[PDB]
Amino acid sequence: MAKLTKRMRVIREKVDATKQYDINEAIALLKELATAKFVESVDVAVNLGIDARKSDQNVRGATVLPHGTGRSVRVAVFTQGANAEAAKAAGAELVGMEDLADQIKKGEMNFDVVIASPDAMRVVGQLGQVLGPRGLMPNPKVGTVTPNVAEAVKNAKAGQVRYRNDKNGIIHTTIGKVDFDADKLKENLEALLVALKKAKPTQAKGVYIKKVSISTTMGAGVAVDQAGLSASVN
Amino acid sequence: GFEGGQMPLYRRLPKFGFTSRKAAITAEIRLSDLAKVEGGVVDLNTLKAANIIGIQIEFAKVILAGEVTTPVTVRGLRVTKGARAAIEAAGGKIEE
Amino acid sequence: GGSTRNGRDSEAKRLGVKRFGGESVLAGSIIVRQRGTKFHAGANVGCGRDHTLFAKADGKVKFEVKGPKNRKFISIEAE
Amino acid sequence: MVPVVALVGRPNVGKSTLFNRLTRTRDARKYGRAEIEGREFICIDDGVETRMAEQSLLAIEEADVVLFMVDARAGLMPADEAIAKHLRSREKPTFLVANKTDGLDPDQAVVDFYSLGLGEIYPIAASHGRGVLSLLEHVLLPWMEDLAPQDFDPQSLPIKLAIVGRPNVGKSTLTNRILGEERVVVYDMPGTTRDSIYIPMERDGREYVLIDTAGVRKRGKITDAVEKFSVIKTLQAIEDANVVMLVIDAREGISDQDLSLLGFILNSGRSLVIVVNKWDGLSQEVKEQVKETLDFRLGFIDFARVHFISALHGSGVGNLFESVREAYDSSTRRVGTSMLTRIMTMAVEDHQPPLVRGRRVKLKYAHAGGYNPPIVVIHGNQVKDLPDSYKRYLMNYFRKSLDVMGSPIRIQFKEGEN
RNA sequence: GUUUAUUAAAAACACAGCACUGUGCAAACACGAAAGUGGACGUAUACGGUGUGACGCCUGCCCGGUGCCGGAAGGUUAAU
RNA sequence: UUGAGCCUUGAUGUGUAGGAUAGGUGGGAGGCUUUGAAGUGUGGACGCCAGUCUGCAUGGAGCCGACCUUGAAAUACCACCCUUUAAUGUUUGAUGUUCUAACGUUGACCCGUAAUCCGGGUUGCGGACAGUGUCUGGUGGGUAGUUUGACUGGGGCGGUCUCCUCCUAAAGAGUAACGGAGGAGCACGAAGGUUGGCUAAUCCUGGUCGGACAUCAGGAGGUUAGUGCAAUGGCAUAAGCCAGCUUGACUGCGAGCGUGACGGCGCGAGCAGGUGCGAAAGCAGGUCAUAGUGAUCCGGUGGUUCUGAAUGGAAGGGCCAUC
């Protein structure tokens, strides 16, 4: 079972106890530290409170962010009675209810990001029974259960950051890879950091942001020179 | 203002306004308080030589009223659409 | 029984007759718990919720039954 | 053997609201069914109470079909998703409905919901009227293919009993015993009343109630925001009885509220049997003979019968079952103008009907206006010509000359002769 | 025996005797915010309380041992 | 002596599929994890042990998964925190025992003082207790302030109090009584909307099974039926009754009326905007009409910038909606 909690004690004793690091320095560090064999993940582990409401906490999904770059994804814009007819004028991407309808019901899919109005969305990104991915899968939520379609296509075309686990009040968001550049990464954090302050209007504690921490794997992680706080949005 | 043990009629009505406080520092001066222009220049702090106007002024509007036919100033004073209409027609500064 | 659960409170019917001012709404016949026993007709659309004669814009009561039989017909003819 | 809609949708909320709107049958009470056309079927109803998880878990496995519920303002909720998953694995069919559907025409259903490991979410009605029709039809069709289970003698009804007492004692636990001797939990709720309330349930046909507000071991689906609603229930407990049981403790019983509670019982006009529960841990010189004596002197002519049980031992268990039956026989006793008139004569001769304003009154027969709580109406002189006291004196006499281990008996007086 | 002075003398109140309980001394208890004091220069055959009412005569029922009675939870006896 | 607050180890997740054992991977099938890497207990969905069982005791294969499938998922390299569980670091509180040094000493003596008070000192005994101060739970008619209507053919007794209809009710109207009679505390998204359509009871007579019909057949009859739930007024232009189709139980306003002391309550066309249905005219602003409920507070929900005390935000409050 548990032999000795020694290998983890010496390691955590190095770089965690809220040792606040330059965001960029952290990333520089992040690729290796203890013998983790290949370049790893950049994560932010954000701790949010409570149960009974979420705004972007335990999301089996992806939301649009300032600085969407990091990845770009496949996108189809489903335009049915909604802010679709504004999307038809917009003419960005491909907009069409009944042809994209077919394409949805065909047998095969690849347009991961369904910007959607009513019919398409249910198919792609949610389905299965005991759903869950090969390691990654077409995801459902993309804020088109908060439908807008035209402006949505601009945001959509650009890309998008997926994060997911289950049910804990602490919202983890995987910031990116280390095959993405250090300063672009910083910007990913800052973007999510601005969003979160935004998030949650429903009082349960008036500062909902505890730890902005940045971490990788193999007992390797650090804290951020916290800069998410309430003052406006920073 | 009573009515025995039949219920207060105003306790048979609700409350509903709301104060401004800004309000008390918003004064209301007239067109014919350019009669008291006392200097060719309409300036808030000259109109206190008239004492026509608040001690703790922070705001004021100039409203209609009779005419005086003279150059005026008006800066930092609000002036109404109708109010400014004829004191424009007497010459005088009046841009704000 | 032994009861005396009472109090009456609808009131009002047939206010005025014939020339009635003339007015955009008349009471005409607001005439209650009925729809016929003062039957609608003339210068006025609809039989009100409680059955109202209330002008088309104006009206003296014209009254007076019609059809081959039937009703008693209250009619409104403009003032 | 037989289907049950079996509402779930997270532990609480409007979940109940929907059952009342699907039911209409009270006093069958709980279990309990929702009727549609010909066929009627039952209905059944983080970090939540351990007891409340155990009942709910108990409900869904016997459950035969299930209904999982979402609100208008509710959407997303991983906990709901877990409950939904549990249901799939264990294997019974589930339909996904959404409570007081609202929105602004069907929109956000079905879109979130496909991830729910369930597909088509039907939106409902309960405060409008179209949205109930689809659900009832869906269930109907398989259920139509099938066709599953759907003086008057003392034995014409099975004996009705409640278990009332303090807002302290773990009465609900004593309730679990009374229903048990099987060593099994039983306070699994189903829903069949108008609104969110409450268990009377029957075993052996005969009805038991659990009542008051907290400490009772009322930790339920919730419905009494204040101290008040619960009382609305105990008054139900009165309606349903011909027997009530008062649990009192020997270490928090006879509180001020409680002695009032017994005083109330007298109004309640239903048979009193007095229970003392969790009484194996009390001190060897009991406190408590005197506690019995103060209640005795108030005084309750009935048959007592004191019980000293625990819900965590059981001693009194048989003696309670027995006492209620004996009490019911006396209470429900076949009566009859003859008996009453004959014993009465003795009484008035012996101790003297009251005189009023130099005119002596006159009694002249009694008859029974019903027996179950025994009422008599005696036609004599005027209402004020007796004091309530003499009424009671003559009543007490009858209570004496023919056994009434049962409830207080009632006497009336009518006038016509004067 | 005692008593409603200034309506009411008794069957009322008291009382020995009896009964019951509480209290181990820095006592119970009582007064006195407490200090102190009384209780007591005493000391469980007492002390305090409470209660009943001479006297005589009407039989006042111990749960421990072991057993019994009802009951369940168990033990013990069962099918196994 | 012994509970538990925290700390990091433990490893994984029952339907066909799924090898079983599919909590939760950025990215997703290199990492030369060099060492010749493994199948052998905790773990694990669940004991459904199996086997697959563990970075979890063997050396035996290039440095090595010894690449995926396939479902929802599952094999290059792994990642993101939970339920759970230890081992270890602890952190802290209980009990257990003993002590003395606070503290107690209504023990004994010495002493101010040839003073039962007291004080100081010595010693004996108790002892971190006891007790008390705060805080704090339970109890508490002992003590304390007061509460316990009104109508009313004397009151109390009783019965009754709102809301509706009818009659009394004197023929505009309006209406007393402890008058006489009865009811109501909703129901209902179809029972609504709209189009198109359809036309009873009750009785005769005749016909399988057919009984005072159960259907069928005709005749008489003329709305006495039936109205969502009284009772009444009203009801064929049906309001009934049947079906298609719809979602106006829309929205923002409102001439002008009735009817209330006031609180106020009701009717109301049309315009405007948007809608819906209907071939089109047109109809649709909840229900046959008449009952189905309540001020004011104060707080909850959602929206708004309106407010907002140095100054910006931010709270609370107003507003709009709703509980």
Swiss-Prot record, chain B:
Its name, as the record gives it, is Large ribosomal subunit protein uL15
The family classification in the record reads: Belongs to the universal ribosomal protein uL15 family.
* Subunit: Part of the 50S ribosomal subunit. Contacts the 5S rRNA.
Q: Which organism is it from?
A: Escherichia coli (strain K12)
Q: Which GO terms describe its biological process?
A: cytoplasmic translation
Q: Which molecular function term from Gene Ontology is one that the record holds?
A: structural constituent of ribosome
Whether DNA damage counts among this entry's keywords is no
Q: Name one GO cellular component term.
A: cytosolic large ribosomal subunit
Q: Please give the function described in this protein's UniProt entry.
A: This protein binds the 5S rRNA. It is required for the late stages of subunit assembly, and is essential for 5S rRNA assembly onto the ribosome.
Q: Keywords of this protein's UniProt record, alphabetized?
A: Ribonucleoprotein, Ribosomal protein, RNA-binding, rRNA-binding
